[PDB]
Amino acid sequence: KSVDFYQFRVCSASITGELFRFNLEQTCPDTKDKYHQEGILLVYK
């Protein structure tokens, strides 16, 4: 039982606990770009 820290408990057993590792490879990718297509434009009323 691990509902909260309020209740007194003793937990020191370690037999078949789940294993975990720290990842140090994630990084923020750089932003992409924009084509920003353009050209000559005429209007007609």
């Binding site: 720290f22 140090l24 994630q26 990084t27 923020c28 750089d30 932003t31 920003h36 297509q37 353009e38 050209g39 000559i40 434009l41 005429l42 209007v43 007609y44 009323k45």
Partner: protein, 160 residues
């Protein structure tokens, strides 16, 4: 006597714009004219299927395009064919896409659209910049947590 054709043509040129950044959208386009701070929208389909029937303008649009691109040729070339669109307001748009050469009275709503697009672009860009910076700080914080966990992993696990 004189035919209606070759006598009066219901469209007249209003303004020209050499630089206009066409940006797509969900289901429409967006043509920007920063010279008068305006933006026009048009459905994605080039609804101007038969602008040839408007046979009058065929002459001068060629001339005006030739003059404009002759002026602009020092830095740009045509990267495709020209098309036409019919906006919702009633105006008509003629578009000639160009690629820069590598060195190696109901018009208020248009202004409203222009301002809204400017604000949206600015806000999205600052959001992306802040997100990238916070992500970098997040990788830094993960490294710090990994370094601190080397002493007693139980406290780190109970905190996380």
């Amino acid at each position: 006597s004189e035919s209606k054709t070759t006598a009066v043509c219901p469209l007249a040129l209003w303004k020209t714009f050499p630089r206009s950044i066409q940006t797509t959208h969900e289901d429409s386009f967006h043509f920007v004219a920063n010279e008068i701070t305006a933006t026009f929208t048009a459905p994605l389909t080039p609804v101007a299927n038969f602008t040839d029937t408007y046979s009058c303008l065929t002459s001068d649009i060629n001339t005006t395009l030739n003059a404009s691109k002759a002026k602009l040729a020092s830095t740009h070339v045509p990267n495709g064919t020209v098309q036409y669109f019919h906006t919702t307001g009633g105006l008509y748009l003629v578009w000639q896409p160009m690629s820069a050469i590598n060195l190696t009275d109901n018009l208020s709503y248009t202004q409203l659209q222009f301002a809204y697009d400017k604000l949206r672009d600015g806000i999205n860009q600052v959001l992306e910049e802040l997100s990238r910076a916070w992500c970098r700080e997040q990788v830094r914080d993960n490294l710090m947590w990994y370094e601190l966990s080397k002493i007693n992993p139980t406290s780190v696990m109970t905190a996380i």
